[PDB]
Amino acid sequence: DIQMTQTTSSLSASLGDRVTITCSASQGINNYLNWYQQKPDGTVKLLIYYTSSLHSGVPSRFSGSGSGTDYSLTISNLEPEDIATYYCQQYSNLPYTFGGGTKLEIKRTVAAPSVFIFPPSDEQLKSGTASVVCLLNNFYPREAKVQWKVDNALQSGNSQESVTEQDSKDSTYSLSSTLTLSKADYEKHKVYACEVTHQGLSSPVTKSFNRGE
Amino acid sequence: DIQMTQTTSSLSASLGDRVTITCSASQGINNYLNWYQQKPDGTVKLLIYYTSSLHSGVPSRFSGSGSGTDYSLTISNLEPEDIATYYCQQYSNLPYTFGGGTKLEIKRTVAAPSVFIFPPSDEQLKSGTASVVCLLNNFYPREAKVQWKVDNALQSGNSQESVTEQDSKDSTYSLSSTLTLSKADYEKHKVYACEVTHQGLSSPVTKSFNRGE
Amino acid sequence: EVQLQQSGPDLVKPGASVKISCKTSGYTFTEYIMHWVKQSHGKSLEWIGGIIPNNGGTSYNQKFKDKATMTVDKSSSTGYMELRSLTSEDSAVYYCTRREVYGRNYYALDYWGQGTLVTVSSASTKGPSVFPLAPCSRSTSESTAALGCLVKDYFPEPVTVSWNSGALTSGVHTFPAVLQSSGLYSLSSVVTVPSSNFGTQTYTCNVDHKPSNTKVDKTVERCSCVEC
Amino acid sequence: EVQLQQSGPDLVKPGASVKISCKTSGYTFTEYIMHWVKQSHGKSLEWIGGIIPNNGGTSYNQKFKDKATMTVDKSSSTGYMELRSLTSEDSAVYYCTRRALDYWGQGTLVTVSSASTKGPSVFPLAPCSRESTAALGCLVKDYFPEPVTVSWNSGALTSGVHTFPAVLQSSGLYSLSSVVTVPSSFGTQTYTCNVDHKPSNTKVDKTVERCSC
């Protein structure tokens, strides 16, 4: 099979910048190359066919060039809705093969997260488990540190994070962190706190509640 | 048919007092008379048969006497669990007929109600109706006045009350009052208050909330 | 122990018939006469009639001669009563009872069933909505906290309410239903506790409306935390 | 408009088979070849094979020759692909496409697992205390398999909504949170999350009540 490589897997650029995505083949494919866009939604659309030809509805800021083993997709001025993964595909020989893809995200100004903490419901708690949720809303960049404290004791190995895809409009991320405890363990302790470190914060923000008492 | 009358329909007495419940027949029934106890829950038990004989499990503080047209059931020292309705029944002639019954309640010391107000849930409110509940907990005597105010305007004809039977332990009553409004009407006004008058209160107690906050 | 287990509550339409059953145990069915009694809401007891299970002989109050029919099934130790040509005036609790004989001819109703509620109405069954009554601590100097469930817009009676699957009974007040102008019933069930907060205890009301086959568990959130 | 409508998500057991359908419209079915593509979670696209609808001729990627069988129904303009001898490695999204691959279906998620379906529990996320925005949500916990959909107020509330990607817990069940941020002053607004888990036929509406004391 013909190996298709996209040497850059991850890429970020500012709004209005010119972006170029690389695609290389293990042998000459004689311009038989297409480009696809996949949104975070999972929906796929054709951008370019036969190296340089535009598909219906594709704006002219998208263009493609290359020959032999090496090809390029260019986005002349980056709009927010260009957030996607871009895939090349050869049809020189069967089987058709795709590149590993290049994920494109936007550089914006730094934005501090709004932080919220949520105690477990009694409805959950009566069944023997407690989920405590810390929410970081609409921040940039993605890098963020969440630390759980229970009576000021740092927790480890009992939380999981989930992060949204970059928003198509404001180009921010949101993050949830869930601390899971037994009912018994939950009812030993009093103060529940998530501490957030992020670039947009001058110093770490703590949100906390006390479990009654 | 033989008419059986219990001239006293309602009776209250202190713990330890001696209580006598009367039963009269429209003609002589020649001692063919039984007594039944019905608890507030609706369960019925035989107390006395043939004027004076005790049924299984009936404590000896219960006794019965009479002849001809007139009969008596006596409780020698009143316990709290004697709260019930008592019925006589003749079997001199068919059909068997019962007296109208005598309800027995306890005299205790005056006790002020604890008052609580509850706003409508959002779960109810989204369906277009608002129920506001005022609770009067564990008071004596039964007589009590609840007035609803909405922005200090006395409400009329849009509430319903319910009162518990006398508690078998502490001999108190409780009362709920429900004010019902459309979602729209509810959302016109701000301050919701139930005002409670009762003998154990030195002056009327008002509980209130403001909608929104 | 002697026991008379009556069939569950029944909604039936005017003009129709209904059959109530009374399943006995603890004694020999064919050795004791069985009597039936009516009690309208807020009213006294009325004798309907009696049946001799061994042969099936009956005597009726004349007031119920065009109303009630009593039968037995000896194989299942069960007494039945059928009420015909139903009207709203037949809406009542009906009791089966055992008759005991003492001397020559001293008779009494020594054991009673728990009663069967018959509602005669053209209206349809409707299951309840269950809403929380959420505890707000109004003052710091509160000796008792209160929460509950509102059980609204059901038909017919009855509903049963328990708390924490029956494990919580202390402090519980389940009020009598009231008929709203809509022709549907509503009641509240409340719990009060000595204000030591609520402890590690949660509060779930269990609502059962047999006529509609509705069972609802509703946890009432305590909201016993604060950020500050 | 050209359109390719694929069948819904499917949980199937290892060793078994599954059949995915692709219902076309907007063009002449018999005039275009149909190709299928695989994408494993977090991975690139793989060409499975193509089928010529008019005759039924097929060509397969050698890697899928003992895995995939492609068929068509000309009467209903529908293409089918059957995957046999299933393993956990066959868990992926599968796309039908029209032949460049100018139009793509929305994808079908196949989960291969011997584990049973389990519907979610839905708990409220409500803050403890009573900024320009407040936050609430629903925790959708302990379901299998993917996916769940979450809406708010039957789809009428979309502004400020973040439904996080599910994470697989150590229990082997999925969990996610859906949160809303809304104007801090909310007084007239109720907030109900609508959770649908089609695999288990579960539909749950949960109104989120405020802790306003």
Author numbering:
A (entry chain D), B (entry chain B): 232 to 444
C (entry chain A): 1 to 228
D (entry chain C): 1 to 99, 108 to 138, 142 to 196, 198 to 225
Any passages from the paper?
Furthermore, we explore structure-guided design of the anti-hCD40 antibody ChiLob7/4 and show that engineering additional disulfides between opposing F(ab’) arms can elicit conformational restriction, concomitant with enhanced agonism. For the most biologically active variant, C232S κC214S, disulfide linkages between C127 and C233 on opposing heavy chains were identified and termed a disulfide cross-over (amino acid numbering follows Kabat nomenclature, κ stands for the κ-light chain). Given this consistency across four different cellular read-outs, we conclude that engineering additional disulfides to link opposing antibody F(ab’) arms results in a compact and rigid antibody molecule with augmented biological activity.
Visual inspection of the crystal structure of the upper hinge aimed to identify areas where opposing heavy chains were close enough to introduce a pair of cysteines that would lead to the formation of a disulfide bond to link F(ab’) arms. The amino acid K228 was deemed to be in a suitable position to target for mutation to cysteine, based on distance measurements. MODELER32 was used to generate a predicted structure of ChiLob7/4 hIgG2 C232S κC214S (cross-over), with the additional K228C mutation, to determine whether a disulfide bond between the amino acid 228 on opposing heavy chains would be likely to form. With the assumption that the original hinge disulfide cross-over is maintained, the C232S + K228C κC214S variant was named cross-over + K228C. As seen with the parental cross-over variant, the cross-over + K228C variant showed two species migrating at ~23 kDa and ~104 kDa, indicating dissociation of the light chains from the heavy chain dimer. X-ray crystal structures were determined from pepsin-digested F(ab’)2 fragments. The designed variants are slightly more compact with hinge angles of 125.3° for the cross-over + K228C and 124.9° for the cross-over + T222C κE123C, compared to a hinge angle of 126.6° for the parent. Flow cytometric analysis showed that HLA-DR, CD23, and CD86 upregulation were significantly greater for the cross-over + K228C and the cross-over + T222C κE123C compared to the parent cross-over, as was B cell proliferation, measured as an increase in 3H-thymidine incorporation.
